[PDB]
Protein backbone atom coordinates (compact mmCIF):
# COMPACT_ATOMS: atom_id res chain seq x y z
CA UNK A 1 0.00 0.00 0.00
CA UNK A 2 1.27 3.45 -1.04
CA UNK A 3 0.17 6.44 0.98
CA UNK A 4 -1.40 4.30 3.69
CA UNK A 5 -1.76 4.19 7.45
CA UNK A 6 -1.69 1.33 9.87
CA UNK A 7 -4.88 -0.70 10.07
CA UNK A 8 -6.34 -1.09 13.55
CA UNK A 9 -7.20 -4.43 15.13
CA UNK A 10 -10.54 -5.60 13.84
CA UNK A 11 -10.61 -3.20 10.87
CA UNK A 12 -10.84 -6.17 8.49
CA UNK A 13 -11.78 -9.25 10.54
CA UNK A 14 -11.69 -11.37 7.40
CA UNK A 15 -8.34 -10.28 5.96
CA UNK A 16 -5.71 -12.96 5.51
CA UNK A 17 -2.10 -12.77 4.52
CA UNK A 18 -0.98 -15.27 1.90
CA UNK A 19 2.70 -16.15 2.31
CA UNK A 20 4.47 -18.10 -0.43
CA UNK A 21 7.73 -20.01 0.14
CA UNK A 22 7.78 -18.38 3.66
CA UNK A 23 7.84 -14.85 2.28
CA UNK A 24 5.35 -12.06 1.50
CA UNK A 25 3.21 -12.72 -1.55
CA UNK A 26 -0.48 -11.72 -1.54
CA UNK A 27 -3.56 -11.00 0.56
CA UNK A 28 -7.01 -12.54 0.63
CA UNK A 29 -10.40 -12.53 2.33
CA UNK A 30 -11.80 -15.26 4.62
CA UNK A 31 -15.28 -16.10 3.32
CA UNK A 32 -16.11 -18.88 5.81
CA UNK A 33 -14.21 -21.27 8.02
CA UNK A 34 -12.64 -23.20 5.14
CA UNK A 35 -12.48 -20.69 2.27
CA UNK A 36 -10.38 -17.76 1.13
CA UNK A 37 -11.02 -15.47 -1.82
CA UNK A 38 -7.91 -14.07 -3.53
CA UNK A 39 -6.74 -12.99 -6.97
CA UNK A 40 -6.28 -15.80 -9.48
CA UNK A 41 -2.87 -14.51 -10.45
CA UNK A 42 -1.65 -15.03 -6.87
CA UNK A 43 -2.20 -18.79 -7.12
CA UNK A 44 -2.84 -20.01 -10.69
CA UNK A 45 -0.50 -22.83 -11.68
CA UNK A 46 1.88 -22.40 -8.72
CA UNK A 47 2.69 -25.23 -6.31
CA UNK A 48 -0.12 -25.13 -3.74
CA UNK A 49 1.94 -26.37 -0.97
CA UNK A 50 4.04 -23.16 -1.09
CA UNK A 51 1.17 -21.08 0.34
CA UNK A 52 0.30 -20.39 3.97
CA UNK A 53 -2.73 -18.38 5.01
CA UNK A 54 -2.86 -16.45 8.29
CA UNK A 55 -6.05 -14.92 9.70
CA UNK A 56 -6.65 -12.80 12.81
CA UNK A 57 -3.42 -10.84 12.80
CA UNK A 58 -2.06 -7.48 11.70
CA UNK A 59 1.25 -9.31 10.90
CA UNK A 60 1.95 -11.86 8.22
CA UNK A 61 4.40 -13.86 10.38
CA UNK A 62 2.85 -14.32 13.82
CA UNK A 63 -0.54 -14.10 15.61
CA UNK A 64 -3.85 -15.46 14.76
CA UNK A 65 -4.48 -18.79 13.04
CA UNK A 66 -2.74 -20.37 10.05
CA UNK A 67 -3.69 -22.85 7.39
CA UNK A 68 -2.21 -24.60 4.40
CA UNK A 69 -4.26 -25.11 1.26
CA UNK A 70 -6.35 -28.11 0.30
CA UNK A 71 -7.30 -26.85 -3.19
CA UNK A 72 -7.25 -23.89 -5.57
CA UNK A 73 -9.97 -23.03 -8.11
CA UNK A 74 -9.58 -20.06 -10.47
CA UNK A 75 -12.53 -18.39 -12.11
CA UNK A 76 -13.60 -20.48 -15.14
CA UNK A 77 -13.22 -17.44 -17.43
CA UNK A 78 -9.85 -16.24 -15.99
CA UNK A 79 -7.73 -14.95 -18.92
CA UNK A 80 -4.95 -12.38 -18.76
CA UNK A 81 -6.05 -9.88 -16.11
CA UNK A 82 -9.74 -10.62 -16.67
CA UNK A 83 -11.81 -12.43 -14.03
CA UNK A 84 -8.88 -12.38 -11.62
CA UNK A 85 -10.40 -14.30 -8.68
CA UNK A 86 -9.72 -17.68 -7.10
CA UNK A 87 -11.32 -19.72 -4.33
CA UNK A 88 -8.91 -21.43 -1.96
CA UNK A 89 -10.00 -24.23 0.36
CA UNK A 90 -8.18 -24.46 3.65
CA UNK A 91 -6.67 -27.59 5.22
CA UNK A 92 -7.45 -26.15 8.68
CA UNK A 93 -10.83 -24.60 9.43
CA UNK A 94 -10.62 -21.12 10.98
CA UNK A 95 -13.39 -20.16 13.46
CA UNK A 96 -14.90 -16.70 13.69
CA UNK A 97 -14.53 -14.82 16.96
CA UNK A 98 -12.29 -12.19 18.41
CA UNK A 99 -10.49 -10.35 15.59
CA UNK A 100 -11.42 -13.09 13.07
CA UNK A 101 -14.65 -12.84 11.14
CA UNK A 102 -15.97 -13.68 7.69
CA UNK A 103 -16.46 -11.19 4.85
CA UNK A 104 -19.77 -9.81 3.77
CA UNK A 105 -19.87 -9.45 -0.02
CA UNK A 106 -21.05 -6.78 -2.43
CA UNK A 107 -24.46 -7.60 -3.83
CA UNK A 108 -24.66 -9.55 -7.06
CA UNK A 109 -24.85 -7.17 -9.94
CA UNK A 110 -23.61 -4.17 -7.98
CA UNK A 111 -20.91 -1.92 -9.43
CA UNK A 112 -19.05 0.64 -7.27
CA UNK A 113 -20.19 4.17 -8.14
CA UNK A 114 -17.55 6.69 -9.26
CA UNK A 115 -16.60 9.05 -6.47
CA UNK A 116 -17.68 6.76 -3.65
CA UNK A 117 -15.07 5.91 -1.07
CA UNK A 118 -13.23 2.66 -0.98
CA UNK A 119 -10.55 1.32 1.38
CA UNK A 120 -7.88 -1.18 0.35
CA UNK A 121 -5.46 -3.00 2.64
CA UNK A 122 -2.39 -5.18 2.48
CA UNK A 123 1.21 -6.07 3.30
CA UNK A 124 2.63 -4.99 -0.07
CA UNK A 125 5.26 -2.47 -1.00
CA UNK A 126 5.00 1.15 0.06
CA UNK A 127 6.50 2.36 -3.27
CA UNK A 128 6.51 1.02 -6.76
CA UNK A 129 9.30 -1.59 -7.03
CA UNK A 130 10.08 -1.26 -3.25
CA UNK A 131 11.85 -4.27 -1.85
CA UNK A 132 10.95 -3.86 1.75
CA UNK A 133 7.48 -4.37 2.99
CA UNK A 134 5.70 -3.47 6.27
CA UNK A 135 5.34 -5.87 9.15
CA UNK A 136 1.85 -4.70 9.99
CA UNK A 137 -1.11 -4.25 7.73
CA UNK A 138 -1.57 -0.89 5.96
CA UNK A 139 -4.74 0.59 4.50
CA UNK A 140 -5.58 3.53 2.25
CA UNK A 141 -8.82 5.17 1.14
CA UNK A 142 -9.30 6.16 -2.49
CA UNK A 143 -12.35 7.11 -4.58
CA UNK A 144 -13.83 4.85 -7.23
CA UNK A 145 -12.90 5.96 -10.75
CA UNK A 146 -15.53 5.43 -13.38
CA UNK A 147 -15.04 2.52 -15.78
CA UNK A 148 -15.18 5.06 -18.64
CA UNK A 149 -12.29 7.09 -17.17
CA UNK A 150 -10.43 3.89 -16.42
CA UNK A 151 -10.85 2.82 -20.09
CA UNK A 152 -9.48 6.22 -21.14
CA UNK A 153 -6.38 5.44 -19.00
CA UNK A 154 -5.86 1.78 -19.99
CA UNK A 155 -7.81 1.23 -23.21
CA UNK A 156 -11.34 0.01 -23.85
CA UNK A 157 -10.64 -3.74 -24.01
CA UNK A 158 -8.32 -3.64 -21.03
CA UNK A 159 -11.03 -2.75 -18.48
CA UNK A 160 -13.91 -5.22 -18.51
CA UNK A 161 -17.28 -5.47 -16.78
CA UNK A 162 -15.58 -7.70 -14.18
CA UNK A 163 -13.12 -4.98 -13.15
CA UNK A 164 -13.54 -1.63 -11.42
CA UNK A 165 -11.03 1.11 -10.75
CA UNK A 166 -10.04 3.35 -7.83
CA UNK A 167 -7.39 5.99 -7.24
CA UNK A 168 -6.72 9.73 -7.33
CA UNK A 169 -5.69 11.71 -10.42
CA UNK A 170 -2.56 13.03 -8.69
CA UNK A 171 -1.51 9.52 -7.70
CA UNK A 172 0.18 8.83 -4.36
CA UNK A 173 -2.48 6.45 -2.89
CA UNK A 174 -2.85 2.93 -4.20
CA UNK A 175 -2.35 -0.77 -3.77
CA UNK A 176 0.95 -2.22 -5.04
CA UNK A 177 2.90 -5.42 -5.50
CA UNK A 178 2.30 -7.76 -2.63
CA UNK A 179 -1.22 -6.35 -2.07
CA UNK A 180 -2.72 -8.51 -4.85
CA UNK A 181 -5.67 -10.61 -3.82
CA UNK A 182 -6.36 -8.61 -0.67
CA UNK A 183 -9.55 -6.72 0.01
CA UNK A 184 -10.99 -3.47 -1.18
CA UNK A 185 -14.13 -2.54 0.76
CA UNK A 186 -16.80 0.11 0.45
CA UNK A 187 -17.42 2.67 3.21
CA UNK A 188 -19.54 0.07 5.07
CA UNK A 189 -16.70 -2.51 5.08
CA UNK A 190 -18.55 -4.68 2.57
CA UNK A 191 -16.06 -6.51 0.32
CA UNK A 192 -16.28 -5.01 -3.16
CA UNK A 193 -13.13 -6.36 -4.80
CA UNK A 194 -9.71 -7.95 -4.72
CA UNK A 195 -6.51 -6.11 -5.62
CA UNK A 196 -5.67 -7.13 -9.19
CA UNK A 197 -3.41 -4.99 -11.42
CA UNK A 198 -2.42 -1.53 -12.60
CA UNK A 199 0.29 0.46 -14.40
CA UNK A 200 2.93 0.74 -11.69
CA UNK A 201 1.67 1.86 -8.29
CA UNK A 202 0.24 5.15 -7.24
CA UNK A 203 1.16 6.74 -10.56
CA UNK A 204 -0.76 9.89 -11.64
CA UNK A 205 -3.72 9.10 -13.87
CA UNK A 206 -3.38 5.31 -13.73
CA UNK A 207 -5.99 3.89 -11.39
CA UNK A 208 -5.66 0.70 -9.47
CA UNK A 209 -7.73 -2.03 -11.12
CA UNK A 210 -9.71 -4.46 -8.97
CA UNK A 211 -11.52 -7.71 -9.62
CA UNK A 212 -15.18 -6.92 -8.95
CA UNK A 213 -16.97 -9.02 -6.34
CA UNK A 214 -20.37 -7.65 -7.44
CA UNK A 215 -19.67 -8.86 -10.99
CA UNK A 216 -18.26 -12.23 -9.92
CA UNK A 217 -20.78 -13.41 -7.35
CA UNK A 218 -21.94 -16.45 -9.32
CA UNK A 219 -18.48 -18.01 -9.13
CA UNK A 220 -17.94 -16.98 -5.53
CA UNK A 221 -21.37 -18.20 -4.38
CA UNK A 222 -21.09 -21.51 -6.21
CA UNK A 223 -17.74 -22.52 -4.78
CA UNK A 224 -17.53 -20.82 -1.38
Amino acid sequence: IVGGTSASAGDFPFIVSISRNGGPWCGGSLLNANTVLTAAHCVSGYAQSGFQIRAGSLSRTSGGITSSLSSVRVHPSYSGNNNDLAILKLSTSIPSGGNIGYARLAASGSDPVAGSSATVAGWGATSEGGSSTPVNLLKVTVPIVSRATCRAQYGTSAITNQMFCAGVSSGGKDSCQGDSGGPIVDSSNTLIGAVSWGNGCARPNYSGVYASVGALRSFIDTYA
Side-chain angles (χ1 to χ4, degrees):
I1 300 289
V2 182
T5 63
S6 44
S8 296
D11 276 353
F12 310 97
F14 57 83
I15 195 172
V16 302
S17 61
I18 304 184
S19 296
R20 184 182 171 212
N21 295 320
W25 185 248
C26 279
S29 296
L30 193 64
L31 299 186
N32 58 58
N34 354 254
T35 307
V36 166
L37 185 67
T38 190
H41 80 260
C42 288
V43 292
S44 185
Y46 296 130
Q48 296 185 12
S49 54
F51 296 104
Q52 187 178 59
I53 276 52
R54 181 184 302 275
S57 186
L58 298 173
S59 173
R60 180 183 64 80
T61 53
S62 64
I65 303 296
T66 62
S67 183
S68 304
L69 301 184
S70 60
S71 68
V72 173
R73 181 184 297 270
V74 306
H75 192 284
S77 298
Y78 180 46
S79 179
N81 296 144
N82 198 17
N83 309 313
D84 190 13
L85 289 181
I87 288 283
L88 317 184
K89 295 292 175 176
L90 303 182
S91 305
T92 302
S93 302
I94 301 184
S96 62
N99 284 312
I100 299 173
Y102 305 136
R104 299 294 302 267
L105 303 177
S108 177
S110 66
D111 186 16
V113 175
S116 63
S117 289
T119 300
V120 58
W123 290 272
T126 61
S127 67
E128 182 181 330
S131 286
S132 284
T133 59
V135 168
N136 279 8
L137 183 63
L138 293 175
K139 64 180 184 180
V140 68
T141 297
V142 281
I144 302 302
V145 170
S146 70
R147 185 170 298 91
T149 290
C150 204
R151 285 174 172 159
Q153 298 176 342
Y154 289 101
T156 299
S157 296
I159 313 297
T160 71
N161 292 346
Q162 306 81 225
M163 297 173 194
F164 72 88
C165 301
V168 295
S169 302
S170 59
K173 289 186 168 118
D174 202 354
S175 54
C176 199
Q177 279 58 52
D179 293 319
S180 287
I184 179 164
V185 297
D186 69 13
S187 59
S188 306
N189 285 324
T190 302
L191 185 68
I192 58 171
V195 176
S196 181
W197 65 280
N199 184 26
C201 308
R203 297 191 178 186
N205 298 305
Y206 286 98
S207 301
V209 191
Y210 295 87
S212 180
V213 166
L216 297 169
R217 284 292 298 273
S218 188
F219 170 67
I220 297 167
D221 299 345
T222 296
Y223 294 107

